[PDB]
């Protein structure tokens, strides 16, 4: 019970790892689910949940449709925010950094790993665009589910991924009487500067 | 099972209400918890969870410390995003609008309703600012817990609230084979324009 500075690891990822791990066993729904916030050209923020798929010193990775809104927004402003809503476990992890596209080699590797039906589904949806009916989706799906016959199901060209850099990582943990613990790890030079923040 | 346009209510709030209600009985942790995203002066988005406290045609309300980061950010850019992470129930509700300060009369009304200890706590924390030790919080708290003796516990002047307007409301509900249902309600003139969006 409690979050004291003296217990903090030098690498915020160590702490994130332990927290991610504990969330998984705690059986949280989609412990890897995180809210990614992006900003459009008019300064208006936008949010949606995506799944964390990989992470290391280079940043956190998620995959998405390259014609989607989050994608157009990242292209005009690569500054993003990630928030892991683990409040059932009285925790929050917020990441701040820049989103950079993944090479086709990486994207390719991950795509040919997800459920065959999900690969077909990736083809079906022109993510974020306005469609006149649900049926359009259902048609295309069956029209491909068999057209591909599953021969391998090709990687759609409009399917990609992003790696968000770690410029800042904030940890929040529930505190009694409303006094929560907050620590901000801030990438500075070749290291991490840590500061406690008032709740 | 399924989210069809023909079943949509004319007022997005009707749907939000039903969804909020079902989440509560489903016993989700903090069904009222939502992630509010704001943007700083450099175009960098920021996120944190806050609790929805009231909502109506005028917008959604939450309270916070007026010296906090979200507050400074709203002052420079009132465009915000709210996301209710109800993915355990395979749902998402995203709200887009402008944040406007609540009058002292409203703030006052709500403040003198929360747990006495939370009112004391509101005084203790200079939210978001860097503090050198947790003890600072704990000291101030006890120093006030008794100083106020609970005489009424005055409303701190640095304690306020915001009402986010409803310019857009998006509903997302889990879909089979990766084909989720998405509907965007867009405030237009004196009404709501509804469009289905590709998943
Ligand atoms: C638990 C969960 C996981 C999701 N994961 C992803 C993901 O990894 N990639 C993705 O593109 N969309 C994902 N979505 C759907 C997105 O929230 C969103 O609807 C979509 O990416 C389009 O957002 P955009 O229009 O802002 O670009 C997920 C939704 C939920 C509730
Ligand atoms: C379930 C939950 C509810 C919270 N509700 C609020 C709230 O209503 N108001 C608030 O100021 N902070 C709330 N917080 C703490 C915020 O997430 C955040 O730490 C704080 O407002 C400071 O953010 P800022 O530095 O971006 O301004 C809550 C955290 C959790 C996990
Ligand atoms: C639209 C969409 N794309 C991508 C993903 C994540 O990739 P995968 O389906 O391989 O888990 C999800 C996960 O819920 C999703 O809903
Ligand atoms: C720092 C902080 N301020 C305000 C609130 C919400 O107001 P209240 O404590 O009256 O529920 C919360 C709720 O978790 C909180 O954590």
* Count of spatially separate domains of chain A: 1
Tally of helical segments of chain A: 5
Query: What is the number of strand segments of chain A?
Result: 11
Q: Would you state the CATH class of chain A?
A: Mainly Beta
Q: Assembly state here? A: homodimer
**Rg over alpha carbons of chain A:** 19 Å
CATH superfamily of chain A: Electron Transport, Fmn-binding Protein, Chain A
Q: CATH topology of chain A, anyone?
A: Pnp Oxidase, Chain A
The percentage of residues in β strands of chain A lies in 35-45%
Largest interface: A-B, 59 and 59 residues
Pairing-aware structural class of the strands and helices of chain A?
Answer: alpha+beta
Bound molecules: flavin mononucleotide, pyridoxal-5'-phosphate
* The CATH architecture of chain A: Roll
Provide the helix percentage of chain A: 25-40%
CA(first)-CA(last) distance of chain A = 17 Å
The gross shape of chain A turns out to be elongated
Helix-strand sequence of chain A: HEEEEHEEHHEHEEEE
Largest sheet of chain A: 10 strands, antiparallel
Set down the secondary structure blueprint.
Two copies of one chain form a homodimer.
Chain A: H1 12-25, E1 33-39, E2 45-51, E3 54-56, E4 59-65, H2 69-76, E5 79-86, E6 91-101, H3 104-111, H4 116-124, E7 130-131, H5 134-145, E8 159-164, E9 168-173, E10 181-188, E11 191-197
Helix pairs in contact in A: 4-5
The complex binds flavin mononucleotide (2 copies) and pyridoxal-5'-phosphate (2 copies).
PDB class: oxidoreductase
Keywords: PLP complex, pyridoxine 5'-phosphate
Assembly: dimeric
């Amino acid at each position: 019970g409690g979050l004291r500075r003296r217990d903090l690891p030098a690498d915020p990822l160590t702490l994130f790892e332990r927290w991610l791990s504990q969330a998984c066993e705690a059986k949280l729904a989609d412990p890897t689910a995180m809210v990614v916030a992006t900003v459009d050209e008019h300064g208006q923020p936008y949010q949606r949940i995506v799944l964390l798929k990989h992470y290391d010193e280079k940043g956190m990775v998620f995959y998405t449709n390259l014609g989607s809104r989050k994608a157009h927004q990242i292209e005009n402003n690569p500054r993003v925010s990630l928030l892991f809503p683990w409040h059932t476990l009285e925790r929050q992890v917020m990441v701040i950094g820049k989103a950079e596209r993944l090479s086709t080699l990486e994207v390719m590797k991950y795509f040919h790993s997800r459920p065959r039906d999900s690969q077909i589904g990736a083809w079906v949806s022109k993510q974020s665009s306005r469609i006149s009916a649900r049926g359009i989706l259902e048609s295309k799906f069956l029209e491909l589910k068999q057209k591909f016959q599953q021969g391998e199901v090709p990687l759609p060209s409009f399917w990609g991924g992003f790696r968000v850099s770690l410029e800042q990582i904030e940890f929040w943990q529930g505190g009694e009487h409303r006094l929560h613990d907050r620590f901000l790890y801030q990438r500075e030079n070749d290291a991490w500067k840590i500061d406690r923040l008032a709740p």
